[PDB]
mmCIF file of all heavy atoms in Angstrom:
data_model
loop_
_atom_site.group_PDB
_atom_site.id
_atom_site.type_symbol
_atom_site.label_atom_id
_atom_site.label_comp_id
_atom_site.label_asym_id
_atom_site.label_seq_id
_atom_site.Cartn_x
_atom_site.Cartn_y
_atom_site.Cartn_z
ATOM 1 N N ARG A 1 37.825 -22.455 -1.502
ATOM 2 C CA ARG A 1 37.519 -23.229 -0.304
ATOM 3 C C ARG A 1 38.480 -24.400 -0.147
ATOM 4 O O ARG A 1 39.021 -24.621 0.940
ATOM 5 C CB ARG A 1 36.056 -23.690 -0.367
ATOM 6 C CG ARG A 1 35.659 -24.895 0.486
ATOM 7 C CD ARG A 1 34.261 -25.377 0.138
ATOM 8 N NE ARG A 1 34.090 -26.797 0.431
ATOM 9 C CZ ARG A 1 34.176 -27.785 -0.452
ATOM 10 N NH1 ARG A 1 34.432 -27.562 -1.731
ATOM 11 N NH2 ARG A 1 34.005 -29.037 -0.038
ATOM 12 N N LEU A 2 38.700 -25.169 -1.214
ATOM 13 C CA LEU A 2 39.520 -26.368 -1.114
ATOM 14 C C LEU A 2 41.009 -26.065 -1.070
ATOM 15 O O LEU A 2 41.789 -26.929 -0.661
ATOM 16 C CB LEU A 2 39.238 -27.306 -2.287
ATOM 17 C CG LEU A 2 37.846 -27.938 -2.351
ATOM 18 C CD1 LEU A 2 37.705 -28.756 -3.615
ATOM 19 C CD2 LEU A 2 37.554 -28.802 -1.136
ATOM 20 N N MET A 3 41.419 -24.872 -1.488
ATOM 21 C CA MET A 3 42.812 -24.454 -1.470
ATOM 22 C C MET A 3 43.173 -23.667 -0.217
ATOM 23 O O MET A 3 44.291 -23.153 -0.124
ATOM 24 C CB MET A 3 43.114 -23.618 -2.712
ATOM 25 C CG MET A 3 43.028 -24.375 -4.015
ATOM 26 S SD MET A 3 44.186 -25.740 -4.164
ATOM 27 C CE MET A 3 45.720 -24.837 -4.287
ATOM 28 N N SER A 4 42.253 -23.545 0.734
ATOM 29 C CA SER A 4 42.522 -22.928 2.022
ATOM 30 C C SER A 4 42.754 -23.960 3.114
ATOM 31 O O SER A 4 42.784 -23.599 4.293
ATOM 32 C CB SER A 4 41.365 -22.010 2.413
ATOM 33 O OG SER A 4 41.203 -20.965 1.474
ATOM 34 N N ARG A 5 42.917 -25.224 2.749
ATOM 35 C CA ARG A 5 43.068 -26.339 3.663
ATOM 36 C C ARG A 5 44.500 -26.860 3.658
ATOM 37 O O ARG A 5 45.319 -26.452 2.829
ATOM 38 C CB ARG A 5 42.104 -27.463 3.271
ATOM 39 C CG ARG A 5 40.700 -27.270 3.786
ATOM 40 C CD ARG A 5 39.676 -27.817 2.830
ATOM 41 N NE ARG A 5 38.323 -27.506 3.276
ATOM 42 C CZ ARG A 5 37.260 -28.285 3.102
ATOM 43 N NH1 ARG A 5 37.340 -29.443 2.467
ATOM 44 N NH2 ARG A 5 36.086 -27.889 3.579
ATOM 45 N N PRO A 6 44.846 -27.755 4.590
ATOM 46 C CA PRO A 6 46.234 -28.254 4.632
ATOM 47 C C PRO A 6 46.721 -28.920 3.352
ATOM 48 O O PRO A 6 47.765 -28.520 2.825
ATOM 49 C CB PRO A 6 46.217 -29.238 5.812
ATOM 50 C CG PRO A 6 44.893 -29.112 6.473
ATOM 51 C CD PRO A 6 44.141 -27.996 5.861
ATOM 52 N N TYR A 7 46.008 -29.924 2.827
ATOM 53 C CA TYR A 7 46.605 -30.771 1.797
ATOM 54 C C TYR A 7 46.515 -30.148 0.406
ATOM 55 O O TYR A 7 47.525 -30.054 -0.299
ATOM 56 C CB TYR A 7 45.955 -32.157 1.818
ATOM 57 C CG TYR A 7 46.657 -33.223 0.982
ATOM 58 C CD1 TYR A 7 48.000 -33.119 0.642
ATOM 59 C CD2 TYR A 7 45.969 -34.340 0.541
ATOM 60 C CE1 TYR A 7 48.617 -34.081 -0.121
ATOM 61 C CE2 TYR A 7 46.578 -35.302 -0.217
ATOM 62 C CZ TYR A 7 47.902 -35.174 -0.543
ATOM 63 O OH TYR A 7 48.515 -36.141 -1.300
ATOM 64 N N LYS A 8 45.320 -29.730 -0.012
ATOM 65 C CA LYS A 8 45.115 -29.034 -1.286
ATOM 66 C C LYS A 8 45.357 -29.947 -2.485
ATOM 67 O O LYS A 8 46.015 -29.552 -3.447
ATOM 68 C CB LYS A 8 46.006 -27.795 -1.406
ATOM 69 C CG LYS A 8 45.941 -26.847 -0.251
ATOM 70 C CD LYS A 8 46.901 -25.705 -0.458
ATOM 71 C CE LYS A 8 46.906 -24.781 0.728
ATOM 72 N NZ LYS A 8 47.495 -25.435 1.916
ATOM 73 N N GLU A 9 44.834 -31.163 -2.437
ATOM 74 C CA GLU A 9 44.821 -32.057 -3.585
ATOM 75 C C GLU A 9 43.433 -32.662 -3.715
ATOM 76 O O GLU A 9 42.685 -32.720 -2.735
ATOM 77 C CB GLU A 9 45.859 -33.182 -3.473
ATOM 78 C CG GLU A 9 47.221 -32.772 -2.940
ATOM 79 C CD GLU A 9 47.967 -31.854 -3.878
ATOM 80 O OE1 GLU A 9 47.993 -32.141 -5.089
ATOM 81 O OE2 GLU A 9 48.540 -30.852 -3.404
ATOM 82 N N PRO A 10 43.062 -33.126 -4.908
ATOM 83 C CA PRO A 10 41.756 -33.778 -5.066
ATOM 84 C C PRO A 10 41.697 -35.091 -4.305
ATOM 85 O O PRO A 10 42.661 -35.536 -3.680
ATOM 86 C CB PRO A 10 41.640 -34.009 -6.574
ATOM 87 C CG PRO A 10 42.732 -33.226 -7.195
ATOM 88 C CD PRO A 10 43.796 -33.079 -6.183
ATOM 89 N N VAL A 11 40.525 -35.721 -4.361
ATOM 90 C CA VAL A 11 40.356 -37.063 -3.821
ATOM 91 C C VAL A 11 41.042 -38.030 -4.778
ATOM 92 O O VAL A 11 41.320 -37.680 -5.928
ATOM 93 C CB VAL A 11 38.869 -37.400 -3.593
ATOM 94 C CG1 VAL A 11 38.240 -36.373 -2.663
ATOM 95 C CG2 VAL A 11 38.096 -37.445 -4.889
ATOM 96 N N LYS A 12 41.318 -39.252 -4.315
ATOM 97 C CA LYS A 12 42.276 -40.117 -5.000
ATOM 98 C C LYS A 12 41.828 -40.576 -6.384
ATOM 99 O O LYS A 12 42.656 -41.111 -7.128
ATOM 100 C CB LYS A 12 42.607 -41.326 -4.119
ATOM 101 C CG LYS A 12 41.455 -42.259 -3.848
ATOM 102 C CD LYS A 12 41.865 -43.401 -2.930
ATOM 103 C CE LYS A 12 40.700 -44.325 -2.679
ATOM 104 N NZ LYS A 12 40.993 -45.457 -1.790
ATOM 105 N N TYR A 13 40.561 -40.394 -6.757
ATOM 106 C CA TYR A 13 40.085 -40.771 -8.085
ATOM 107 C C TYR A 13 39.478 -39.599 -8.837
ATOM 108 O O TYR A 13 38.534 -39.780 -9.604
ATOM 109 C CB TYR A 13 39.069 -41.908 -8.005
ATOM 110 C CG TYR A 13 39.628 -43.199 -7.486
ATOM 111 C CD1 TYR A 13 39.024 -43.856 -6.436
ATOM 112 C CD2 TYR A 13 40.753 -43.772 -8.058
ATOM 113 C CE1 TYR A 13 39.517 -45.037 -5.976
ATOM 114 C CE2 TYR A 13 41.261 -44.953 -7.589
ATOM 115 C CZ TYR A 13 40.641 -45.579 -6.544
ATOM 116 O OH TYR A 13 41.133 -46.768 -6.066
ATOM 117 N N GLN A 14 40.009 -38.396 -8.642
ATOM 118 C CA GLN A 14 39.433 -37.234 -9.291
ATOM 119 C C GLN A 14 40.527 -36.229 -9.589
ATOM 120 O O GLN A 14 41.607 -36.254 -8.997
ATOM 121 C CB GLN A 14 38.352 -36.603 -8.423
ATOM 122 C CG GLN A 14 36.960 -37.075 -8.758
ATOM 123 C CD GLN A 14 35.965 -36.713 -7.693
ATOM 124 O OE1 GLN A 14 36.215 -35.839 -6.869
ATOM 125 N NE2 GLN A 14 34.833 -37.404 -7.686
ATOM 126 N N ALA A 15 40.226 -35.348 -10.536
ATOM 127 C CA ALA A 15 41.095 -34.245 -10.897
ATOM 128 C C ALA A 15 40.233 -33.001 -11.031
ATOM 129 O O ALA A 15 39.029 -33.083 -11.270
ATOM 130 C CB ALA A 15 41.851 -34.525 -12.197
ATOM 131 N N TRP A 16 40.858 -31.846 -10.850
ATOM 132 C CA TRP A 16 40.181 -30.567 -10.981
ATOM 133 C C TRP A 16 40.469 -29.957 -12.345
ATOM 134 O O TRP A 16 41.423 -30.316 -13.032
ATOM 135 C CB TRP A 16 40.619 -29.613 -9.871
ATOM 136 C CG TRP A 16 40.338 -30.112 -8.506
ATOM 137 C CD1 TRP A 16 39.420 -31.051 -8.145
ATOM 138 C CD2 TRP A 16 40.989 -29.707 -7.300
ATOM 139 N NE1 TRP A 16 39.451 -31.247 -6.789
ATOM 140 C CE2 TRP A 16 40.411 -30.436 -6.248
ATOM 141 C CE3 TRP A 16 42.004 -28.794 -7.010
ATOM 142 C CZ2 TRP A 16 40.812 -30.280 -4.929
ATOM 143 C CZ3 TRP A 16 42.401 -28.643 -5.705
ATOM 144 C CH2 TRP A 16 41.809 -29.381 -4.680
ATOM 145 N N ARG A 17 39.618 -29.008 -12.726
ATOM 146 C CA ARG A 17 39.735 -28.345 -14.015
ATOM 147 C C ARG A 17 39.169 -26.944 -13.894
ATOM 148 O O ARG A 17 38.042 -26.768 -13.425
ATOM 149 C CB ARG A 17 38.997 -29.128 -15.101
ATOM 150 C CG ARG A 17 39.199 -28.611 -16.510
ATOM 151 C CD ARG A 17 38.044 -27.727 -16.951
ATOM 152 N NE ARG A 17 36.844 -28.482 -17.295
ATOM 153 C CZ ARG A 17 35.636 -27.951 -17.424
ATOM 154 N NH1 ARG A 17 35.426 -26.654 -17.256
ATOM 155 N NH2 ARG A 17 34.611 -28.737 -17.727
ATOM 156 N N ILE A 18 39.950 -25.952 -14.311
ATOM 157 C CA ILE A 18 39.487 -24.576 -14.378
ATOM 158 C C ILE A 18 39.960 -23.967 -15.688
ATOM 159 O O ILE A 18 41.085 -24.200 -16.137
ATOM 160 C CB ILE A 18 39.961 -23.748 -13.162
ATOM 161 C CG1 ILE A 18 41.485 -23.749 -13.036
ATOM 162 C CG2 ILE A 18 39.335 -24.285 -11.889
ATOM 163 C CD1 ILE A 18 42.010 -22.792 -11.989
ATOM 164 N N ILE A 19 39.082 -23.186 -16.307
ATOM 165 C CA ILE A 19 39.381 -22.550 -17.581
ATOM 166 C C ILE A 19 40.382 -21.429 -17.351
ATOM 167 O O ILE A 19 40.362 -20.765 -16.309
ATOM 168 C CB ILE A 19 38.089 -22.033 -18.240
ATOM 169 C CG1 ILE A 19 37.177 -23.202 -18.628
ATOM 170 C CG2 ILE A 19 38.406 -21.206 -19.471
ATOM 171 C CD1 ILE A 19 35.724 -22.813 -18.818
ATOM 172 N N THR A 20 41.277 -21.228 -18.318
ATOM 173 C CA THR A 20 42.348 -20.243 -18.203
ATOM 174 C C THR A 20 42.370 -19.327 -19.419
ATOM 175 O O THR A 20 41.427 -19.331 -20.215
ATOM 176 C CB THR A 20 43.696 -20.943 -18.027
ATOM 177 O OG1 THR A 20 44.743 -19.970 -17.951
ATOM 178 C CG2 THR A 20 43.980 -21.910 -19.172
ATOM 179 N N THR A 21 43.429 -18.533 -19.555
ATOM 180 C CA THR A 21 43.552 -17.600 -20.670
ATOM 181 C C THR A 21 43.394 -18.324 -21.997
ATOM 182 O O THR A 21 44.224 -19.159 -22.365
ATOM 183 C CB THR A 21 44.910 -16.899 -20.611
ATOM 184 O OG1 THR A 21 45.123 -16.373 -19.296
ATOM 185 C CG2 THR A 21 44.973 -15.764 -21.623
ATOM 186 N N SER A 22 42.329 -17.985 -22.718
ATOM 187 C CA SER A 22 41.936 -18.673 -23.940
ATOM 188 C C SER A 22 41.916 -17.685 -25.096
ATOM 189 O O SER A 22 41.351 -16.593 -24.970
ATOM 190 C CB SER A 22 40.556 -19.308 -23.773
ATOM 191 O OG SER A 22 40.545 -20.247 -22.714
ATOM 192 N N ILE A 23 42.519 -18.070 -26.218
ATOM 193 C CA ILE A 23 42.514 -17.274 -27.444
ATOM 194 C C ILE A 23 41.860 -18.093 -28.552
ATOM 195 O O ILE A 23 42.330 -19.185 -28.892
ATOM 196 C CB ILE A 23 43.930 -16.790 -27.816
ATOM 197 C CG1 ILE A 23 44.908 -17.944 -28.095
ATOM 198 C CG2 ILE A 23 44.479 -15.902 -26.712
ATOM 199 C CD1 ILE A 23 46.235 -17.488 -28.680
ATOM 200 N N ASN A 24 40.736 -17.583 -29.068
ATOM 201 C CA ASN A 24 39.946 -18.183 -30.146
ATOM 202 C C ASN A 24 39.779 -19.693 -30.003
ATOM 203 O O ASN A 24 39.676 -20.405 -31.006
ATOM 204 C CB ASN A 24 40.556 -17.841 -31.516
ATOM 205 C CG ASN A 24 41.953 -18.419 -31.720
ATOM 206 O OD1 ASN A 24 42.169 -19.626 -31.603
ATOM 207 N ND2 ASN A 24 42.906 -17.553 -32.042
#
C-alpha cells in the first residue's frame, strides 16, 4: 500500500522493517 504512492518513504521520525532471507 505505502509503496504504490508517489514518495514511498516513512514519516520523518520512523523507519520500516521487514524480515528477509534468514539462515539459522
